[PDB]
């Protein structure tokens, strides 16, 4: 324009670049945006019911294949016969089986004691897990109503009760809508109120990583701001270990001896698992916990294999390389791999030869190979989300856990490159300078390989840090049953006798803004953590002393009732303004609205006790010319206090002069108006 | 010289714009690339095959 020969075009270039910088950051936020694992819920074999009871199985190298279910009506005498090929016999004589299958809380989830007998056990441990994956991600499970949040559940349709043409007595129309894989992801979105893509995918034993991949690819784009991705296989009938045994694919002892010379086949188990997932710059902007980031995912069918159940050796290399070129990484960044490790004698040699071809390509540091199926058995469709719970507790515990049955590494694989180090021992895995990435791979019977690359959470240096010890807030307990509320203060009590000195403010933040406002409420506000331990033990027995118990029906709607006269004491709020500036300042606006209409101000009145109010020209109560405005000022400041603490009235009602305060707080009369 | 900054900072603007015209038609193909229906097979109620 004027100076030199550039003052205008160099503004359109600045803009064409900050538009190119902001349009090529939109391409990397739509196909490669990290998807944070906000929380994990998991009920796995071996009594595992939470991913801190799941690390207490991997870290001690405990196998959870311990025997067939007894409480499930299984015919444990017709499942076994000396003949290897009978028609109804099963070859797995063990396996990882949970007792949480024949167990559910119908009343909590709003289903009748007849609609729930018909709920497939794969739907009843997805509703329970959906409540937990949210109650441990912070997000109140009842706060996600009409919120875009996809439920992506992986399920191998399994057969529960009477055939749909043989309807029961109470379970009749609800036998198809409680068992259809359709309504496992759908029951969750209904009970939780979610309005997002509630898709129940089915890709055999990769339906958890496919559901995780289908949720990550539903997030990178944006159709659901949040997403519950996971999968469950709880086997109601012994109909899967009696068919898988008919193709002689099972092991006679139920162990998935991964990458081991004793490999017999799958050690088929049953389990669940759910991940709460959100775009990394949506779980940092909302403060949600970020446990690990799912960098990239890939799904790749085996193609024309040598059998439907037969694995492809060059369709896994193209899925370990699609998830490795969609995450923007390379084969040398992934420290460890949670491989399938089915324990098969022709699927493990093919898996690992696909792992010396996509990862073990001149590896400077050996790849730490493992499988969670070794610890719990093949959890089928829950495997792949039980590998992103194994390699997300491996992120956050600084340790690669064991592969429990692989000391005698199989002789059908070539472990000569020294590029893969099967995890026969707990390998330390601390936070170094290079990000800690892992790979979880689930390949299925249908021939749909899936591979997901996990990375450790970006090191949060400060985040929500420390401030100063001050007034303590109520410890907010609530449950949907009077016997479940005793169990809440029988599990928070333990979560503090196991973890003592836990900041009270932190047990009143993630209990109040971390849980749902369920009917049976027992909040309380102690002196400290150890003072609350007393009330916790009292509520375990139902004895409320120091605890504020109550009952509700999702009630809300408080009413500010305003007494006119007769509620004054000699020291009304003497320290209520000395402890918080939300009452002192609340008094300040009333005072400056009372100064032009009153001489003596309210500030020194409630500041001083009656024993010291006798010398400030303001009697304790008899001065109706002074205490009536004081009453109104105390009243309005207190009402503003409850409003500042989130207590808003559905109605204000005043008695005689509390009418003035009610009008002041209702908005019909200004602060100065009602003050005058 | 190159017509100082008249034929240069304007030569970099036909790249930073022609790259913006190709990094925005990648976003219109990552979100709204219209997919075809190349063929349709149906076995539906009745004689439909």
């Amino acid at each position: 324009m004027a100076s030199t020969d550039s003052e205008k075009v160099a503004e359109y270039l600045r803009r064409a670049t900050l538009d190119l910088r902001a349009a090529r950051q939109r391409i990397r936020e739509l196909e490669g945006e990290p998807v944070a694992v906000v929380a994990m819920a998991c009920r796995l074999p071996g009594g595992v019911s939470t991913p801190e009871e799941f690390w207490e199985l991997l870290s001690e190298g405990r196998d959870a294949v311990a025997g067939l279910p007894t409480d499930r009506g299984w015919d444990l005498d017709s499942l076994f016969h000396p003949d290897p090929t009978r028609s109804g016999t099963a070859h797995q004589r063990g396996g990882g089986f949970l007792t949480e299958a024949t167990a559910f809380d119908p009343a909590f989830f709003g289903m009748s004691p007849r609609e729930a007998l018909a709920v497939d056990p794969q739907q009843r441990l997805m509703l329970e897990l959906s409540w937990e994956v949210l109650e441990r991600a912070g997000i109140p499970p009842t706060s996600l109503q009409a919120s875009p949040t996809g439920v992506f559940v992986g399920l191998i349709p399994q057969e529960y009760g009477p055939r749909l043409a043989e309807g029961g007595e109470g379970v009749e129309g609800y036998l198809m809508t409680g068992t259809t894989t359709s309504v496992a992801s759908g029951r969750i979105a209904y009970t939780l109120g979610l309005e997002g893509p509630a898709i129940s995918v089915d890709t055999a034993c990769s339906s958890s990583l496919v559901a995780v991949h289908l949720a990550c690819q539903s997030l990178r784009r944006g159709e659901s701001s949040l997403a519950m991705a996971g999968g469950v296989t709880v086997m109601p009938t012994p109909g899967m270990l009696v068919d898988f045994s008919r193709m002689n694919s099972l092991a006679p002892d139920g162990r998935c001896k991964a990458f081991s010379a004793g490999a017999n086949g799958f050690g088929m188990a049953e389990g669940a698992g759910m991940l709460l997932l959100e775009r990394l710059s949506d779980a940092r902007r909302n403060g949600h916990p970020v446990l690990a980031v799912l960098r990239g995912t890939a799904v790749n069918s085996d193609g024309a294999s040598n059998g439907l159940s037969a694995p492809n050796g060059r369709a896994q290399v193209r899925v370990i390389q699609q998830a490795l070129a969609e995450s923007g990484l390379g084969p040398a960044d992934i420290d460890a791999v949670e491989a399938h490790g089915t324990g098969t004698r022709l699927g493990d040699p093919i898996e690992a030869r696909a792992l010396f071809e996509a990862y073990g390509r001149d590896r400077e540091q050996p790849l730490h190979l493992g499988s969670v199926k070794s610890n719990l058995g093949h959890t089928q469709a829950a495997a792949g989300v039980a590998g992103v719970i194994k390699m997300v507790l491996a992120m956050r515990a600084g340790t690669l856990p064991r592969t429990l049955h692989a000391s005698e590494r199989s002789k059908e694989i070539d472990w000569s490159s020294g590029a893969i180090s099967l995890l026969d021992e707990p390998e330390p895995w601390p936070a170094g300078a290079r990000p800690r990435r892992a790979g979880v791979s689930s390949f299925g019977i249908s021939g749909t390989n899936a591979h997901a690359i996990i990375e450790e959470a970006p090191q949060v240096v400060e985040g929500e840090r420390v401030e100063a010890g001050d007034v303590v807030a109520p410890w907010v307990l609530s449950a949907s049953s009077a016997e479940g509320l005793r169990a809440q203060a029988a599990r928070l009590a333990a979560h503090l006798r196991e973890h003592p000195g836990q900041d009270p403010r932190d047990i009143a933040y993630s209990l109040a803004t971390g849980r749902a406002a369920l009917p049976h409420r027992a909040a309380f506000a102690p002196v400290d953590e150890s003072a609350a331990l007393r009330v916790l033990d009292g509520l375990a027995t139902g004895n409320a002393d120091g605890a504020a118990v109550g009952t509700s029906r999702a009630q809300q709607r408080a009413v500010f009732v305003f007494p006119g006269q007769g509620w004054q004491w000699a020291g009304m709020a003497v320290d209520l303004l000395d402890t918080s500036p939300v009452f002192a300042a609340a008094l300040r606006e009333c005072a400056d609205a009372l100064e032009p209409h009153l001489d003596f101000e309210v500030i020194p009145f409630l500041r001083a006790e009656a024993a010291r109010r006798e010398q400030d020209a303001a009697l304790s109560t008899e001065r109706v010319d002074v205490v009536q405005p004081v009453m109104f000022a105390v009243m309005v400041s207190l009402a503003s206090m409850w409003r500042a603490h989130g207590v808003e009235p559905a109605a204000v009602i005043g008695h005689s002069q509390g009418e003035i305060a009610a009008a002041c707080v209702a908005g019909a009369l200004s602060l100065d108006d009602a003050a005058r | 010289m190159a017509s100082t900054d008249s034929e240069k900072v304007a030569e970099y603007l036909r790249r930073a714009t022609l790259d913006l015209r190709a990094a925005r038609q990648r976003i219109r193909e990552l979100e709204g690339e219209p997919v075809a229906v190349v063929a349709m097979a149906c076995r539906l109620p009745g004689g439909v095959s």
Epitope: M1, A2, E7, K8, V9, E11, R14, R15, A16 | -
Partner: antibody
């Protein structure tokens, strides 16, 4: 983000001195050439002036309507643009904006309502 | 001299219907670089003016894809592919060839059409 948040409106009598501050946070303040566009109540935008970048000289170009009256400055270490409005008359009752471009107005800020009434 | 730019000052838009504001310049805004020096600004009613288009056809980031840009050296056009309830206001055709520009133009007074 870039946010050009402004401050400094108010009520004065014709012939006063008023300061208009443009807080720039999100971009390198010294690269752009901030400008101040006036919009009298309910009519079209009129451009008051703009300071060149410190690297472009810092020459300040003003309008014909406000030459010898207004002066515009900028600081990087304190990262603020200034419209120094001296000898105001009745015309300055308006919503003054601060855009981040001499020929390519960008963020525009928010809108500082300045009023010059007697 | 100065570039005099005019437009359909009182253009009505009905929601969901493509609309088209046009600009006509007396002089030629196609500078030698082959880049037009016309910009399209939007002042939404009672808000800070927005930059919709720079260099005639290029759209600023953060601006809805609806606003499309085109034009020769004299006649120009803004093609809103989809007018919604935020697409209403004043659309200023503002040149860049001859800085300084004391005015942003009369601006196209856009209205929801009935």
């Amino acid at each position: 983000e870039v946010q050009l948040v402004q401050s400094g409106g108010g009520l004065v009598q014709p012939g006063r001195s008023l300061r208009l501050s443009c807080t720039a946070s999100g971009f390198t303040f010294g690269d752009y050439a901030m400008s101040w566009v006036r919009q009298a109540p309910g009519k079209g935008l009129e451009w008051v002036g703009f300071i060149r970048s410190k690297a472009y000289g810092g020459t300040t170009e003003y309008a014909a309507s406000v030459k010898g009256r207004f002066t515009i400055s900028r600081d990087d270490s304190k990262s603020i643009a200034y419209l120094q409005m001296n000898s105001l008359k009745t015309e300055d009752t308006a919503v003054y904006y601060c855009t981040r471009g001499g020929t390519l107005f960008d963020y525009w800020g928010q809108g500082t309502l300045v009023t010059v009434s007697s | 001299d100065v570039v005099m730019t005019q437009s359909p000052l009182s253009l009505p838009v009905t929601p969901g219907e493509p609309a088209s504001i046009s600009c006509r310049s007396s002089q030629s805004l196609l500078h030698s670089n082959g880049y037009n020096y016309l910009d399209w600004y939007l002042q939404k009613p009672g808000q800070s003016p927005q930059l919709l288009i720079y260099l005639g056809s290029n759209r600023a980031s953060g601006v809805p894809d609806r606003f499309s840009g085109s034009g020769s050296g004299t006649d120009f056009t803004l093609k809103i592919s989809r007018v919604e309830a935020e697409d209403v206001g004043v659309y200023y055709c503002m040149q860049s060839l001859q800085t300084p520009r004391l005015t942003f133009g009369p601006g196209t007074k856009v209205d929801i059409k009935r």
